[PDB]
Amino acid sequence: EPLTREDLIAYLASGCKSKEKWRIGTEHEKFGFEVNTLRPMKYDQIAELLNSIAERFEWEKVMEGDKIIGLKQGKQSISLEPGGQFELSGAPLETLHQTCAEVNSHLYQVKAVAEEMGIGFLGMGFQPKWRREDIPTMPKGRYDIMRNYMPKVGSLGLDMMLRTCTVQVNLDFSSEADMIRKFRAGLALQPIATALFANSPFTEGKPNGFLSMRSHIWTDTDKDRTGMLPFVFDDSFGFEQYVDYALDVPMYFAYRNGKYVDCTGMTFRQFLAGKLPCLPGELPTYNDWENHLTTIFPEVRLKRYMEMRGADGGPWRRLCALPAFWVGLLYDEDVLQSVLDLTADWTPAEREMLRNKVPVTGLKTPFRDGLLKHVAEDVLKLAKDGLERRGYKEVGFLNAVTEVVRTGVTPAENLLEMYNGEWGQSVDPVFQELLY
Amino acid sequence: EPLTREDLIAYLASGCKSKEKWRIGTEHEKFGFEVNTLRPMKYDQIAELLNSIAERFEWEKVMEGDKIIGLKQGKQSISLEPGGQFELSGAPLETLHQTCAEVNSHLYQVKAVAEEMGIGFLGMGFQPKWRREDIPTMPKGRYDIMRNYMPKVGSLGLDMMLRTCTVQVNLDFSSEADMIRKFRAGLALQPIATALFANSPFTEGKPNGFLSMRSHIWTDTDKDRTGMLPFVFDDSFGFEQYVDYALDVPMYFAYRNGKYVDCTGMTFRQFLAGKLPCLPGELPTYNDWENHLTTIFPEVRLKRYMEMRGADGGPWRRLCALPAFWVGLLYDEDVLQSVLDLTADWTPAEREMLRNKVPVTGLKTPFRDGLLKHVAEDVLKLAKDGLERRGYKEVGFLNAVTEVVRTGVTPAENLLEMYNGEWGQSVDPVFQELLY
Numbered sequence: 052e053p054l055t056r057e058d059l060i061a062y063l064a065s066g067c068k069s070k071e072k073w074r075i076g077t078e079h080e081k082f083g084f085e086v087n088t089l090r091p092m093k094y095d096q097i098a099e100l101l102n103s104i105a106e107r108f109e110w111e112k113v114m115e116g117d118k119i120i121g122l123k124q125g126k127q128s129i130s131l132e133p134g135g136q137f138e139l140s141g142a143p144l145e146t147l148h149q150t151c152a153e154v155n156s157h158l159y160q161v162k163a164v165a166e167e168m169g170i171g172f173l174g175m176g177f178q179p180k181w182r183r184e185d186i187p188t189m190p191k192g193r194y195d196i197m198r199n200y201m202p203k204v205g206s207l208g209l210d211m212m213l214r215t216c217t218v219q220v221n222l223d224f225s226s227e228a229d230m231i232r233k234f235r236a237g238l239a240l241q242p243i244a245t246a247l248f249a250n251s252p253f254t255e256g257k258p259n260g261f262l263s264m265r266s267h268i269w270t271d272t273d274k275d276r277t278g279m280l281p282f283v284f285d286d287s288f289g290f291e292q293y294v295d296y297a298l299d300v301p302m303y304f305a306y307r308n309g310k311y312v313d314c315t316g317m318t319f320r321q322f323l324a325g326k327l328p329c330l331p332g333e334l335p336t337y338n339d340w341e342n343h344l345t346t347i348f349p350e351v352r353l354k355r356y357m358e359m360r361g362a363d364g365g366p367w368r369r370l371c372a373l374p375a376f377w378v379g380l381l382y383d384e385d386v387l388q389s390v391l392d393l394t395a396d397w398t399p400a401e402r403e404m405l406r407n408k409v410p411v412t413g414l415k416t417p418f419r420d421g422l423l424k425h426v427a428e429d430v431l432k433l434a435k436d437g438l439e440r441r442g443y444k445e446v447g448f449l450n451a452v453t454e455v456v457r458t459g460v461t462p463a464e465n466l467l468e469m470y471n472g473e474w475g476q477s478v479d480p481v482f483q484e485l486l487y
Numbered sequence: 488e489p490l491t492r493e494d495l496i497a498y499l500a501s502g503c504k505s506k507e508k509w510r511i512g513t514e515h516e517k518f519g520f521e522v523n524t525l526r527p528m529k530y531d532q533i534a535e536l537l538n539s540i541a542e543r544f545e546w547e548k549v550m551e552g553d554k555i556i557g558l559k560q561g562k563q564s565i566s567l568e569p570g571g572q573f574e575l576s577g578a579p580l581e582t583l584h585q586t587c588a589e590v591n592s593h594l595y596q597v598k599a600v601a602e603e604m605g606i607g608f609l610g611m612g613f614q615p616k617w618r619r620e621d622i623p624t625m626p627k628g629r630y631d632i633m634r635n636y637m638p639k640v641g642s643l644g645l646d647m648m649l650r651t652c653t654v655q656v657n658l659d660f661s662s663e664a665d666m667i668r669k670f671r672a673g674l675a676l677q678p679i680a681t682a683l684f685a686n687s688p689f690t691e692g693k694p695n696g697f698l699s700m701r702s703h704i705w706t707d708t709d710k711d712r713t714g715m716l717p718f719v720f721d722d723s724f725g726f727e728q729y730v731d732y733a734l735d736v737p738m739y740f741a742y743r744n745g746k747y748v749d750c751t752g753m754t755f756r757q758f759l760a761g762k763l764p765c766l767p768g769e770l771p772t773y774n775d776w777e778n779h780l781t782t783i784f785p786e787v788r789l790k791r792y793m794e795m796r797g798a799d800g801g802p803w804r805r806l807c808a809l810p811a812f813w814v815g816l817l818y819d820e821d822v823l824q825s826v827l828d829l830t831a832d833w834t835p836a837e838r839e840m841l842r843n844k845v846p847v848t849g850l851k852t853p854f855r856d857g858l859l860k861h862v863a864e865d866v867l868k869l870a871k872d873g874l875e876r877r878g879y880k881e882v883g884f885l886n887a888v889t890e891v892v893r894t895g896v897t898p899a900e901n902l903l904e905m906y907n908g909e910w911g912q913s914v915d916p917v918f919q920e921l922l923y
């Protein structure tokens with residue numbers, strides 16, 4: 052009995068969980084580099100790193116052919132982005148104390164192997180030193196397919212793939228109503244998160260004119276699968292409408308017979324009808340749908356959980372702060388409403404503007420009769436309220452962004468200040484400044 | 488059916504484990520201090536620390552009355568030495584990668600709570616700044632009993648209790664023959680470990696004339712229950728002879744009716760006969776025997792496992808190095824024999840001398856036609872051989888002592904060099920230098 056559109060809707064809806072079952076999934080990506088040369092870490096070094104972590108700390112190996120590309124341990128996964136960015140996808144955890152302990156565990160295991168390899172890790176949103184052609188490409192079929200497709204849909208998507216790092220958080224919803232509310236809160240506030248975590252002002256050894264070049268890159272990666280999703284704020288919005296959106300987003304690939312088939316320029320509607328030209332007659336599974344859902348990259352993404360996709364990679368205290376920010380805003384029901392009331396009369400154009408201007412000016416971005424800084428003050432207060440109300444003593448995790456909001460000065464701006472003062476207008480010291 | 492001497496022997500013998508079942512138990516102690524004042528951390532702060540770790544990181548509370556004095560999580564325990572020294576007693580682990588991960592986990596959890604309390608931790612062998620009367624006394628009955636007894640048996644035992652920190656390792660034996668061999672290897676080499684980890688040259692803000700004042704303190708704590716145990720090297724030595732030794736060591740207390748009874752100046756032989764004056768008619772259990780065994784403090788201690796008791800507390804890389812040192816020497820059968828051959832013609836006087844002089848001169852201690860440094864070169868080579876042969880890639884854990892052996896310069900000596908140069912003959916910067 053083949054899958055239908057209605058099944059695809061139900062798949063998203065099956066993510067619905069009672070408040071007591073809500074968890075926090077935190078993912079972050081890091082640039083590996085040779086300590087002596089600063090050169091980006093190569094696949095051969097990455098494979099040694101993965102193999103050694105697996106043996107020392109009891110992880111299961113994830114393979115593509117004879118190539119190790121990741122690790123699994125319970126509900127944690129370690130994986131590789133296209134330019135070797137080294138990712139932890141954490142477990143679904145109950146508290147942010149557990150989240151930060153999980154981040155520390157990972158950083159410890161990584162460094163315990165990498166140190167004798169002469170390898171360091173950098174927490175930034177965009178690779179500050181090296182050109183696109185300097186970046187190692189990982190031996191993964193799905194990335195080869197994507198690398199070929201990116202140039203067809205934008206100028207900066209290859210930089211997304213090879214030269215950016217994010218920290219994100221994955222969160223749960225209890226119902227469609229709850230999902231709609233979190234999606235709208237998450238989208239309206241995403242540019243505030245982008246500003247607070249902005250950490251990518253350098254390209255190839257110089258300032259690039261941005262505070263988050265990473266966030267900027269996502270505005271010219273591919274228009275079919277990015278952005279602020281204004282339709283989410285339409286009264287019609289719901290699981291059904293997100294499915295229709297996703298069905299309109301062209302496919303990258305389908306996994307069949309052990310490998311990723313290039314299905315670029317094709318649609319999941321074709322797949323549903325058994326009429327994918329890359330796979331004539333094959334019918335999709337839930338895994339196929341899940342796979343397709345994971346090729347969509349808006350500022351907030353929906354699957355069986357919701358992803359806040361807004362934020363630059365950063366040092367460990369910000370890795371623990373990102374999930375804390377969103378937990379406080381979205382996991383307290385009153386605070387969630389407060390965000391909705393705060394952002395209720397924001398127009399589609401205003402949201403779009405904030406998303407587009409924040410990468411340049413961060414919290415100094417003008418907004419109405421003031422700066423984005425003033426809105427960030429209100430939102431941070433709310434985030435702290437929600438952590439306090441959770442009763443787990445998690446509010447100290449927002450310490451790492453309290454000073455940013457207070458001063459209106461982003462992390463990227465602090466880096467630029469060092470670059471111009473103490474660093475003698477070189478980015479090389481950032482590899483010590485932001486070393487894990 | 489009451490316990491007999493033969494049962495007490497069998498209790499030690501029940502520790503015997505097949506090589507595949509051997510594990511590594513690592514314990515270390517740390518001084519807590521207020522970051523601003525450097526004052527030693529008080530019991531009220533300690534209780535908050537313990538309570539917060541328990542709640543955040545899921546530890547079970549260990550109580551004495553309404554007073555929290557420790558935590559339990561599986562086979563790990565956190566506990567308090569008499570002056571508040573903050574101890575982790577780790578799980579029995581298979582590899583040193585696991586050991587060091589365990590140390591990191593603990594340091595992370597401690598710091599994650601202590602930072603907002605304004606509390607730091609110092610890894611040293613002896614409290615470098617404060618007087619004996621400055622040290623908080625923990626509200627534990629068994630320590631109150633001990634504090635009263637110490638002055639009756641030495642001048643420095645109160646300093647042992649209040650002002651020292653160790654890192655130790657607990658290891659397994661397969662049989663009585665194996666136990667005898669490890670005990671003799673462990674005793675003969677203990678002063679080499681003491682020298683390599685020597686990290687206590689300051690008393691009350693000045694140099695005290697030693698490299699390990701901590702190790703020195705153990706030579707005037709109590710002669711009945713300390714030292715190099717020359718009888719271990721007698722041909723008669725075995726489980727039986729250790730039991731006779733322990734039976735000769737006077738008791739501190741017995742736990743009965745929820746509390747520690749003062750049984751100082753009494754013996755376990757009295758207990759065995761039901762003739763303890765502190766507990767007339769009570770007969771001992773295995774727990775009572777275990778309790779008594781844990782009031783014996785030689786350079787190597789025997790219970791159901793063997794403890795290397797030689798080494799000063801220190802920074803995290805030395806916490807992982809201590810257990811690695813002994814694992815390489817004692818857990819490879821060939822290396823174990825090599826240690827025995829190396830130390831075969833060492834006399835009781837020579838061993839005693841090394842134990843007594845190492846606290847003053849470390850690796851510069853004369854020994855025969857050279858310095859202790861030259862013996863340490865041989866022993867470190869052997870330790871590395873044993874780690875290599877284990878096949879777990881654990882040899883990098885001896886990196887933290889390779890330079891000490893090479894140069895013949897102890898950690899204590901490096902501290903003294905800083906004290907006299909950069910620190911302006913104050914010990915206060917050690918609280919930053921050796922901050923966890």
Ligand SMILES: N[C@@H](CCC(=O)O)C(=O)O
Binds near residue numbers: 211216217265
């Ligand atoms: N590395 C991308 C995110 C890639 C992904 O996980 O989809 C970024 O910096 O935003």
Ligand SMILES: N[C@@H](CCC(=O)O)C(=O)O
Binds near residue numbers: 612
């Ligand atoms: N704190 C003591 C060891 C105490 C014990 O655990 O018996 C030392 O520095 O050696």
Ligand SMILES: [Mg+2]
Binds near residue numbers: 078080132138
């Ligand atoms: Mg990723």
Ligand SMILES: [Mg+2]
Binds near residue numbers: 514516568574
């Ligand atoms: Mg102890």
